[model samples]
Target: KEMPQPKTFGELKNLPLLNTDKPVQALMKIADELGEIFKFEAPGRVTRYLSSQRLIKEACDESRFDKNLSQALKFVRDFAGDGLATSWTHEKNWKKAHNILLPSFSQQAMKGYHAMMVDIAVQLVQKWERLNADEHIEVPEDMTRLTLDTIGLCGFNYRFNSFYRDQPHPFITSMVRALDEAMNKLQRPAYDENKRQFQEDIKVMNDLVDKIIADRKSGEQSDDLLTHMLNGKDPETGEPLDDENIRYQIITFLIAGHEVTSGLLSFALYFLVKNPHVLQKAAEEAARVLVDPVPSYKQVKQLKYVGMVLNEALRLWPTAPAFSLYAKEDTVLGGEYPLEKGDELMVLIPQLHRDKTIWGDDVEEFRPERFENPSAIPQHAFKPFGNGQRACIGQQFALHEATLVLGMMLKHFDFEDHTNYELDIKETLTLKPEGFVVKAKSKKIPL
Candidate 1:
């Protein structure tokens, strides 16, 4: 047998492989210590951690391996239902939603969404401008405000008015707590207090989504994701999204769209401020391309340096982090490792991005040039949005919004780590730099 046999006298069986709130880093730590292929455990389940690009390519073959809902995504179903992000590849709703939403997510569609992206970014810029120099910025929180507002405006023609409120919207408060609890699992006395809270949380989110759907169905039709989903038909079968499924799709967009973009911007800002040369290069690109306070649709993509900084930032942190892969049938991987049909392999993307063999010895360094030649990179090596048809549908939306927001901020604000805050992550399903504080001084000062 190519594999090591189980059941040694000293083999201690445990549930969680590593004890930490940050499983993203903890998983990568195992990958670093234990070769390319290692087995890890969850409750009643054992999954392999695969990082070798060879294994990745093999797994990527659709006939061999398909995406598994795994724990986190499957757990999300209670919240998101069989919508785009949480649905299985074979699910009818995934196909229907995918076919319907694909055209809406294309680069051409970004043009429609650009003004809305600007609408939110300008709100953020004005907020930062209003903040006194002595008052520190909460990077992740503000980024969330901007992103949540952006998605609301663009996706459903809805407004969270997040920046106007001192506290987050009720939906956000519930969704944030709900998402974190789902990933961690739950329990208690008083007949499960956390469970009771979790139920209420989901109720609040579901009710909010229901109202959005209900109002749109009754109100004058508008051209946005909600209207599109309501009116659009599947290109193949001419099937329209069902009522409950439509609700799920909106929830999916809100959940899948905002958090990653928010985290992406948060992390990119952290990297930009930390690396002055990289910062200046990106800032210079912002200055060169962003003629207005908010860059136009035509102009934002011209900030190639800012894009690279994001590519590199995503390489380092990944935001959405790991994706789950499972063999479609019992198969041997890399001509050696045997796997069962349903056996899950979690791809540790941060590890893959940092592989020195592929990235050179300075793998940990924050260098944007690594992505300057994207075509030269190995296959399945830089999967920040994820892989295959199952990749994040909102990729263009997330990147466009990130680039625009970052470009806009760079054009107007000069930033430093106000709290001298180190990068500690507050991870739900997606990880963000926890309590990351910054002091953003306006370039328009001396007014």
Candidate 2:
């Protein structure tokens, strides 16, 4: 039953039906118990819905971000609490990071993604030639690792030789693990002590962030994102950013700039392996677009079908999965819930994307053309990168990278599997496939 809408966070907090102090608290603790109920009951969707709204709101605010630009850049370099070096989610700082930082990966940077595409294509072709007999070939997990590291290199002048060199960096592993852990924690029941530990871990993250700040300040001449932050000044201020500010910004970019899209690519390829028809169509589109040996930045845009394929993949598997917002004051949601100050609301992309009412009965099927037609999907039904000002800044960058990589691989060979299988998605902060396996082979050309 939909309980009457509460007027404030306090009212909602006191509402007897709310399972925990925070929605994330309830989600983390109650997920196991609620898992079955969600499958059977419609109400389970509410948690996801509310949680999404909360994530969106929290991410967009600017004051929650780093005030100092130079310091923020430092954090991205030296901070190593996890495998990925990033700081806490400060909304204000995040906004600045997106707006100010995105331009660093200009059209020139896209050329780098283009270069990496060729590298990946060559790798795939070599594998296809070596394993032609319909065998289950293991894709180097490093495809994602390297692609992402390269993205950072070109976009931010950073280098993370994730593939060739297996540098057991704490920041990298931490980033991969933390994203999953934090997202998982959200859907659990309230655990105050665990919450405290989570905060402590966050503190450890900050300490690492501080070191990056110091290194940048020490006149370490470099061209990476960290250097940019220390040397990169507000065009207006003509002054360098302080350490605290740099820490916030650097961590933000490392996390948002790389991981989200990287996870998506991993799943996108997995989806291609499972859905042969879509894979074939993508290859067809790639060949038509690339009349030359490699595709140009302008040519990348021409591959409309590839774009549609990526869009469809994102629809089926949004990396962020959910976004959130808090009611600044009393507000009614969908003319239903009367939300008030501090009351959180989450918008569930998966629930919304897969909703029978919006996407129809074929929602579960992987149909790339659904995006091509446009009208097939209704308004407010699709929001993978997010919506409005808080929308993903790296949208274009990620799209180009996905298309190039997909195009390059498709032009060379085809992927096949020995046994019929289905996708097994494991959702935490991002939607990832668990041990996804496929047989990659050379596409036998028609005589």
Candidate 3:
């Protein structure tokens, strides 16, 4: 008998990107309906892998077994001794600092980010704010750079001063570049070679980080993630984090907190320029809410459309697309197929966000209103910060930061199309844009 055409393992080899499109719908459905098990590859079991309970269970358990974070936290707690500090004072620190100083700086950033934008806007309105502008105006890149620095100053009494300048410190620049090179290779042909190079680059990263660690270890008392971890402690561990452990924690925050965030800001501006309607509506909202040139934290909520536009942009083009975990032991995934240990499973988050079955017919369309209903999208369906226990710890901080920066920008200027609304993405470590040039034009709206 002639073999059945690639039906459920037999005809699988002929299929093109079969598991790629609408995968969230396929996988989630498979998990919920079919007891959470299936073969990612079949016919040729050499490449097959499993999902379901076994995959998640093992990965999570290993994270615990390795004591990666737990050990890090212990080291931090020990170092801090009895001082108040944080490994990365992004979220919780943002909240605390905002509570203490939000009134002043939210007002200040509202005024400052706007004033900075407007001062430039006024000049641009009269002149050229071109894409490849010889003028070299550092547009703060992302809300993260601004917010992190802003929050860093407010929360820990330190100055990151990232956005105000064209480039960051030598360590910061090297770290970002290394990550970009390494991550980009993950998507290309030389993945294995790049992966090896990535490990080597990480060594460089660790060495630079060693400088920060050394300064803090010497009781420099410099305020930053390094100082915080050097001085802070885990309640459970009752000890300050060690210098080496602080290195890992700080590195994680540096990558996790700022990379995607900076990219998101670039893309947000890109989308705003690409879609005039969005820009206009967002600007209008900014005007209505921000009676003053600067918007206070209270006024940030009024910039609802800004959040919508950002959410939609993130959904369309997530900066960090996926994360991976190696499977362990022979187990059934989604209750479908058997998988031995040593296999890897990468959760394609960006693809999942665009899953047709989950996101509806117009999944590709850029409509921010879809988020207005909140309940319209299913849980675990549109998590830009990832989901479960691994969810971004600084989600709230990012939201507040983005709101403030975007709101301030809208209040001051009507941005001109820098790249003629056809900017392409530069997907290195984060989802930055290639030709993301925004022309700052003065907003004539005080009416």
Candidate 4:
């Protein structure tokens, strides 16, 4: 067979490289085909890996780049439908939304959502309890449910009933459908069956959130993210978020916030199952700290080993494989290559996290102990949640939720590595453990 000819950047839309399921593999090929700083033949389209710690920090700094997001994210906006704009997709829209929404994810605000998160996590444990010992469990599906339910309640005071219900929630189905189809759209520029469903799914989600907002506005008030958003004022303009922007913010949380945590949970559990020593240590910590099945804010902080384990998993498998920023004007990277205006710079997080120089020869190993003394790692070297002003606003929120759930679950059940599975990562907008199969049994512990 003749080797396939290299396509021009304009022809990139037709290339197999657009497949998102295996983004690392695809990105690796691109890096191999084109060296560290080559153009994709598009004037503004360029892909470069920032393996240098210094350059990664400089590129991610919000003030340094004119473009805060990537065209890839615009696919999200397309699938998200109208009335939905987010900082993830729109730099201008994000400024307004970020100011209004920042307070909702504050340390104080996270406390208000803790009980609800714990409640949803408990529901997950109860469901697993119904399963027979050694029954197969799909990690991504279950974590998606738990995180979806958690985010729905915490984000907008809605219940997905994902664990209790036999049929999947309409909102969840639509959300998944839209994400799956959007990824397909990225790979193939042409419209197909997925495009039709993608459009319809966005409508379902938009309508669902719209009704929720309407119901909340018409009735008695409660304290939740939705309420916070409804009453929030944009600091710069001193104006409240109108209905359309409010809807966008809510949808963004549902898609972005929900998926990353769920992906982390899925991958974290997969890693623990594969590494029994770490799992044992984490479970032991969980048993010791969680006197009750439920964990309070203070108790959750004490699951140091569990925290380390989650951090290790995140390091190995960041939910977002890579992120991009464009140059405001002509600039040089690493004081070496000159990047013209509108040039794209990609931060390949997986490569950066596993860089042999930064993480040592054992970077590939699954050792939670690396985080035991986090100060040992360089500042910009570890960025699973991103960095600078564009850093995840919900960093603390995600940690609290993941820790609480992991702590509670570890104390209650033992996840067995019946399959001894290797990590098979699946990527959409985020990365998750594919075919993450495990079994569970109740663990005896003193309450």
Candidate 5:
């Protein structure tokens, strides 16, 4: 079977340029022209995007296609270095980190992290509480603040106190800069200056990570992922993570743990404000569940409509956006695309979620009711967290925390998309709403 691709002259010649701020938009345009299962080439990479349900499902089969690191995350690996998200499945550290960290995010473990989630969520609510009625709140920044603080407090016992300051701690600033700089890679003596700064950024991050670990080591036990990394043994080999490995794992969590969840909250809020009916329904659900001003862990789970809204937001704009997989052996995708061993495929999650056959003609609309049944959307179709063994390890953590904050936000305030900002995304290693602002009005906690 033949796979579809744009006609190319020799190599990397005829295909459209995907190097843009909104690469997903360019990819969407390509999909609009070609069928869902197609391939494109860039200078250093060849990409085949698989968007059909069966294609994605088949690709997810651990027996066939296995997860592959995308080039963007390869940049992440420069710092994270085989720490959970950037590691290949075969890597020893990924397995060790997975086994050690997996239990920390379980339903029961959510209870342990629940207080931290509430604390940070409350911090955001309090920050908004201090805001004047007409003040426009920047959704992504504050959500990032909330999420980063939540991860710091929960994943480790440290604090970013992101809500307490206008600028993030130096570690975060260095991190985003390092990640961005690493991606647009280059070389020269003039580039030598960036090299120096990049090294310094790495050092700052490394130093801070070392300090966090050192503080943990010097203290009474704090029940968090850091404690797990320091003390827990691999279930299989019975080996503890050395300090360097623990540092890598820490860097991984610092980025992977919070980045997309912030985007999730941002997109969900924008969608809620853009569609007030949905917002009202979500707010009402929050009202019902949160009879107490603060949500109990049980109450967080009870915010069903808010969860559905989060799902729908992920459907429209999965913050992680896309992930890559490659054939474990020679295989054919969708019975039409033939591939040899190591042939690569990208699950364009946003495209998969928008499949009209699965999501209906109103697929583009922001409707929470679509996810009321949840399984109604089918497997592989709604994979905001991704798939298989390498799927997001922090999914439970992310959803629980994001849902809690969102439920609280809806219960406490009525947000207006005042300017009706047309959807635009800020592309980083993940996707987030760009310049989305809303005016927040106090609604008080519902009884």
Candidate 6:
């Protein structure tokens, strides 16, 4: 049912149903109801939404309970409690774990993964070439397959080979079910069978990862994330993560590594197709930077224009659109809006990204040049990655993957946007482009 338009702020106090089809304009109406800060407790316990970047930054800082995850995140924590899901951890323990695993995603480690990344992109391009004409490729579906394969190989040296198969792998099915179950739980408490199904799905996923870990233990280890976790010890206590904790970390990476990147790739392609001039410019840059079809680490970094398009797409369609934090102690946000301990906050990334005040009147327009000099923007204004100490650890990993995949795609193919296609935004735990379909053919450009 469509919510009746709120004529008064009191009407806005009622939490709006989370219908994914509503555009930013509709969401803006809700924000307008309470001005800069909106508070509503009717949903369950108290919840708040912060639209101002200044206020969001203050609340996101380390001092103000940086580790507090929202209730929605509990669904994920239920499956992977000892994992990095913010809901599952406190600040001190989170820091210890974060430091131990940080080296795996370091620049040195990522450099070793570039060859694999390029190989995966090449495989995707070949698949696109072989597709029968008139078969419009679904952006999200294909991109998800690609990233799933990439993360499986890079993160754990496991090969899902998701693209080669007609049906999704067992792990994929279980992971997808787990997320669906998580989202379902957020709307209403789980029933008996629903809870049972969640457990069964998690067991399937956990069993697979555990088997992989056990196999690794029996043989010589390789330089993958699995090995990093196995070798990692707490900085303070020097305690190594146990087998159960190790399994959680592996599951955490598998879940995070694939979905958001798939959404990003889909959105980036959608934006490039929608804006022809920008697409042409991006292709030209790809041609110049990528003398070879495959990209090296240095070559990928030199893709300034390609990076700009990805950044611009991230601005317009952030994958993880909103994340929450709770106040640990009584604190004031933006020097206003007094918050009591445990008051939940939802940081509205989509709203803040398009804030006219911070991004200028042209905020809604698709323009990549605005990111040319990133320092020019406000400190907390552009946060595709969350701000402050608890920001995403794999940011560099994500950027490199996006740049390489996008660079290679633009180099080898010409994407034709579907004329009648309309942008449909899908939201679950993450933001996704639904029904964003396009066709492509291999470019005849000499390698």
Provide the overall lDDT of each model, using Cα atoms, as 2-decimal numbers. 0.82, 0.55, 0.52, 0.74, 0.83, 0.78
Task: Please give, for residues 1-447, the per-residue lDDT of candidate 2 as tens digits.
Answer: 243332223423422334333332343334334321121112222222332222334323433311121122223234332121232234334444444455555556565456654554444445456764646644435355645665555444455655445553566455555454454443234567645655565566677667656755656664355666666655434455556766655566667656577667667777777787888888888777777665677888788887787787787777776555444555554354454555444455555465556666897788777886777655556788765555666677778777776676676666665555556555544555656656665554321
Tell me which residue pairs clash in candidate 6. none
Poorest 10 consecutive residues by lDDT, candidate 2: 36-45
TM-score of 4: 0.90
Q: What is the Cα root-mean-square deviation between model 2 and the actual structure? A: 7.9
Clash pairs, model 5 backbone: none
Q: Where does model 1 exceed 4 Å of error?
A: 1-12, 186-191, 445-447
- Candidate that would win on TM-score: 5
Task: Tell me, by lDDT, which candidate is best.
Answer: 5
Clashes of 5: 0
lDDT tens digits by residue: candidate 4, 87-133: 44354556777788788888777778888988898888877778875
The regions of model 6 sitting more than 4 angstroms off are 1-16, 19-29, 87-93, 445-447
Query: Any idea what lDDT model 4 has?
Result: 0.74
> Rank order by lDDT, top first?
5, 1, 6, 4, 2, 3
lDDT of 3: 0.52
Residue-level lDDT for 280 in candidate 1: 86
Scored against the true structure, residue 344 in model 2 reaches a CA lDDT of 41
Off by over 4 Å in 4: 1-14, 29-44, 79-85, 88-92, 189-194, 445-447
Question: Residue 9, candidate 2: how far off, in angstroms?
Answer: 22
- Error (Å) of candidate 5 at residue 166 is 1.1
- By TM-score, is 3 or 5 better? 5
Estimate the TM-score of every prediction. 0.94, 0.70, 0.64, 0.90, 0.95, 0.92
Question: How does model 1 score by TM-score?
Answer: 0.94
